[PDB]
């Protein structure tokens, strides 16, 4: 079993919270790259890519805050 | 069950809001391509295609706004 | 009763200040998705969506300022 | 009964002063990780996380001051 | 009473400024569709439709400007 | 008498510098909404609205600079 | 009568120096939360909030300096 | 005296530059509407209307450029 | 073997997704330049060129988004 | 050797694709100007001139599209 | 003699570099407003206005860069 | 005569070094607030405000350094 | 000597490139207005007017392109 | 020998990469200004000008990216 | 067997408490250096590196405190 | 053999992790500068340059973090 | 001979490392201010100004680091 | 042979432990000062300078500790 600290648990709640968004973006890209002119594939890939962008930004900026909550507590040990 | 975020729900409200506009445009194109000289088929395909254009533009520009509402909130985490 | 700090009160003043803007945007989207070609539904949804964008941006950037007012006071404890 | 000194009492006044902020941040993270694109979940998680940051900073910098009040009195015993 | 923000008030000044232009275009269309060969109905419907086009364009581009005035002020909070 | 700090004085110099631009835009909108097809009302409202846009942007970006001049001086107290 | 030391007097000179800035920010927030799209309410709340930020930072960093002037004198008793 | 900014002065240079073109178009329309078959009235109204079209287009596109010169300077304040 | 990062893989999925669209546009141009008056060559070159335009725009705007997803994560390292 | 970019190569494929259409139009004009009443010279010059018109329009509108494909890629560098 | 810092000297090099472009635009506007239908006045005013636009944009964006060169040096004093 | 220490002399060298920059910014603001659409007033106020920002930052960060040079010498008395 | 920027030089290359086309159109109009029934004057005025139309369109659309080349470079200063 | 940094080398690779495109555009303009009605000169000048536009845009946006690669490394020195 | 004092035991509790965080950071760096554009590798390396930073800071500041607890006891021997 | 510390090893893992990205960007620039109008060269250079940007940012921000991990340990020696 | 410490030598290595970049920026500004519409002068001034920005930032942030290396050694004298 | 005490041996273990870091920083500065815009020279100089900073801080804080170990033993002679 690999070790997971608290920032790993905060980061992996977004990983387990979305089910297969990492797959659905790669699947919708492979459908779009086969035919980049279908409106139904562009509108589906816009929605999946614009959610993967907000997924990664929320999952990164949350880890950045809890790292700043912790580093300001460890600063007060000494 | 495939995962659906909030931009998927906003995009699929237009998908479920129109019933079979994705079908009616493809059906009216197949009737028009068989006979591209009937005024009744041209006038019916003009109406269906000009609604599919506004369908896709509204469904795309709405996802683009809610992606900008969200990305300016996630910007304020840190 | 759930706990509410000062940034919750600042954030919920915008929530209680608008009455049902969270509802009126979802209602106007459901009317627009049923018929994305009516000018009266597009002009009503433009106004509601452009107010929900300014609602969320003002409600987020205000919380961000009061969080920076507070964190610069707590910095001066030690 | 576990022993609690004076710095434990100062630290646990913040723990008992907030009711369930340690829970509400973990609950709002679990709601946000399931859907990191809802503006209502981002705006609620911004407020809860920005209060948990000020909670921990005030609860840490207060313990640090009272530890410096005490260590400068114990310095004057000898 | 439904909530109305400032962009709703700017949009509804055009709605209340014209009296029944939303009705007069629908009435003139119903008179024209019954007989699309009368010059008096075509010349009356041209005038009503060409005013409804300028009505919607002015009512939309004004909301778009005041949304850009506001979003550049909210940008300067932080 | 309400209190006015230095950023209030900088903001209200633009308010007192224009005489009744806040009125002239609302007056020209009410004349335009009554008849959104007159070229003389559109050309007068374009000029008033394009000045109100530059009025608010200059009045906001100036307050933002003097707030950054001050916050970098208060940073140097400690 | 509650006791007030010298750092209370330095802190309350800023409290009595501004008249009702603690009120004017809460009043301007309540006007802005009712309508977060009025440029006149955003420009007035920007000025009041950007003064309350400099008010609290100056009132905190001044107390921090006089606490360091005093603690370096009390250090020289022994 | 009503206030006039710089875009008002640029717009009113076209207003004062033509003398009574706003009158001469309305006068030539009233002469043409009384008799829309005189070649001398049609040829005079063609010239006046085709100058009023270029008058309004030049007076509008000039205000639009100077509004873009200014907004790109105010962008560089911050 | 040349190195390929993740943006190379996203860009080359469009390259491998279309088979020989880079060839079919150059072949249809060489057939059209030999005879730019055949309707069958113009209608075939319109379809191929209008797909190569959407191919390059989708393949470029996708790389631009994933470059912005990544640069906002690398921003949060420090 | 003069330099030739990609738009030069696209433009010169039409130049090399037609053999001597730039010559055949000038030759057929010189034969027609010597005798502008021969039906065989008018019918031959109609065909050559109507092909030179479609030659230049296709050769110009193709360069215009590839210039818009490129400028939207260079837009995504930054 | 009025004081001139380095950003004044950078801004006034554009002012002294053009001779009377601030005059030539106002002169060409006064000639165009007297007759907004002369092609020779429109083509001369297009050239003067399109140079005044690039004059102000270059003169503003240069001051903005040297202000950012300086503010990043003054940041390194402390 | 008011007393002036060494940090007063360092701070007032910037005050006497600029002649009337405290006046020229207030004069250029009063000219800009009367007409916030003139490019010549915006470009002059950009230069004056961007110099007043660097004036105050250099005059503050220099006092902050000499206060740290001195406080580390007074630390070595005992 | 009047100042001439680069767009003046591009515009005046067309002015100096044609010799007296501005004169020859005015001369051919004065000959045609004296007798608007001579085929030799109509055929000469058709050729001169149809060249003055292409002269002004090429001289205007070239200035418009070089103004867009420049404004996209000045955009990249900051 | 004049000094050339890395952004000079990136900018001058486009300068040396095209041979005489700066000359060929000025030569094709001088041929077009002498006769702005020849289709062969318009079609040759369209190709040269549309390549000079993409030349300058690529040469500018590349320098802008490498300036942003460098400024984010120099940011990490301190 | 190497000797381990009490500060070694406090330091090695963090070493044995994390399992292979010293390995997982080096493994995630080697995966990221092979492809520094994958969002899944950047988001995984952000979490591992931000935990290794808090690991080392907590493991260092704890040893620093227990070294100060001990040195103030050994000071009281004599 | 040149000396390499730990930050050299962290920096050179990105150097050895990409194979010849420092070469492929310089090769793709030399191909693009020879012809800055080919869509295939622009789309290949966009991908290589957007990966070199993320390469340098990740390789710089990682060295910056490990320098801050180390400097906070060396701070705890004394 | 003026005295030069080690930070003077570090600062003047950038001064002697660039040859005449302080001159080439002032020369390119004087050429650009004479004609702020030439693309060749804008593209040359963009490259020189964007190198002078990185010159001053690297030359300032390096002096700032070596001043922090030294001040942390002089801190350890006592 | 110059005399070397124990603190000289502790200080010179860092001097002999790094091979030519005192040279590699001076060599990388001389390469960077010749061209302060190359990303490869900035990224190499960042790594060398950030190691020279940790080299000097570790080599200074170690001498400071062993000087405090010794001075507390010499204190116990009498």
Name the token pair of F13.
Answer: 């110099």
Contact F51 H11 (CB under 8 A): no
- Using alpha carbons, list the distances in angstroms from residue H41 to C24, H30, M33: 55, 10, 19
Nearest chain K alpha carbon to M67: K50
Name the token pair of B38.
Answer: 């009937």
Nearest chain D alpha carbon to A57: D36
* Contact by Cβ (8 Å): G41, G32: yes
CB contacts, 8 Å: F69 with chain G = none
What is the C-alpha separation between C43 and C34, in angstroms, rounded? 15
In chain G, how many H helices and how many E strands? Answer: 3, 0
Mutate to test the interface with Q, among M5, M64, M67 (most CBs of Q within 10 A): M5
Of B2, B64, B67, the CB nearest to A54: B67
CB contacts, 8 Å: P48 with chain I = 8
What is the C-alpha separation between G20 and G18, in angstroms, rounded? 6
What is the C-alpha separation between O46 and O52, in angstroms, rounded? 10
Contact D38 B76 (CB under 8 A): no
What is the C-alpha separation between L42 and Q33, in angstroms, rounded? 18
- Eight-class DSSP state of I4: -
Q: What is the 3-state secondary structure (H, E, C) of G61-73?
A: HHHHHHHHHHHHH
What is the C-alpha separation between A62 and A68, in angstroms, rounded? 10
Provide the shortest C-alpha distance from residue F5 to chain H (in Å): 21
Nearest chain J alpha carbon to N18: J3
Nearest chain J alpha carbon to I62: J76
Beta strands in G1-78 (DSSP E): none
CB contacts, 8 Å: O21 with chain A = 3, 5
In degrees, rounded to 5, the angle at the alpha carbon of residue A58 between the alpha carbons of residues C73 and B63 is 125
* Contact by Cβ (8 Å): C13, C23: no
What is the C-alpha separation between L51 and L69, in angstroms, rounded? 27
* Contact by Cβ (8 Å): I39, J54: no
Q: Report yes or no: E70 at the G interface, CB cutoff 8 Å.
A: yes
Contact I53 J59 (CB under 8 A): no
* Contact by Cβ (8 Å): Q25, K40: no
Q: Report yes or no: Q61 at the N interface, CB cutoff 8 Å.
A: yes
- Using alpha carbons, list the distances in angstroms from residue F18 to D67, E10, F43: 58, 22, 20
Method used experimentally: cryo-EM
Residues in chain R, total: 78
Provide the shortest C-alpha distance from residue J30 to chain I (in Å): 23
Name the token pair of G45.
Answer: 């709340």
Measured in whole angstroms, how far is the alpha carbon of residue F35 from the centre of its chain?
26
CB contacts, 8 Å: F55 with chain L = 36-37
Q: What is the 3-state secondary structure (H, E, C) of chain R?
A: CCCCCHHHHHHHHHHHHCCCHHHHHHHHHHHHHHCCCCHHHHHHHHHHHHHHHHHHHHHHHHHHHHHHHHHHHHHHHC
Mutate to test the interface with E, among C23, C47, C60, C65 (most CBs of E within 10 A): C47
Provide the shortest C-alpha distance from residue N14 to chain M (in Å): 15
Which residues have CB under 8 Å from K11's CB, separation 6+?
K59, K62, K63, L43, L44, L46, L47
Mutate to test the interface with E, among C15, C43, C56, C64 (most CBs of E within 10 A): C43
What is the C-alpha separation between L26 and L32, in angstroms, rounded? 10
Name the token pair of E74.
Answer: 């909210």
Question: Is K in contact with O (3 or more beta carbon pairs below 8 Å)?
Answer: no
Of C10, C11, C71, the CB nearest to D57: C71
CB contacts, 8 Å: G42 with chain E = 70, 73-74
Name the resolution in angstroms.
3.2
Count Cα atoms within 13 angstroms, Cβ side, for N50: 27
The continuous run of DSSP H or E covering K5 comes out as: none
The continuous run of DSSP H or E covering C38 comes out as: none
CB contacts, 8 Å: N68 with chain P = 53
CB contacts, 8 Å: D43 with chain C = 11, 56, 59-60, 63
Task: Give the DSSP per-residue string, D5-24.
Answer: -HHHHHHHHHHHHSSSHHHH
Name the token pair of L36.
Answer: 């916030």
* Contact by Cβ (8 Å): I49, I25: yes
Nearest chain P alpha carbon to N78: P64
Provide the shortest C-alpha distance from residue F57 to chain G (in Å): 10
CB contacts, 8 Å: C30 with chain B = 13, 17
């Amino acid at each position: 079993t690999p070790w997971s600290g608290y920032l790993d648990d905060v980061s992996a709640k977004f990983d387990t919270g979305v089910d297969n968004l990492q797959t659905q973006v790669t699947e919708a890209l492979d459908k779009l790259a086969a035919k980049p002119s279908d409106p139904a594939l562009l509108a589906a890939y816009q929605s999946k890519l614009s959610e993967y962008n907000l997924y990664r930004n929320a999952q990164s900026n949350t880890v950045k805050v809890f790292k700043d909550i912790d580093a300001a507590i460890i600063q007060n040990f000494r």
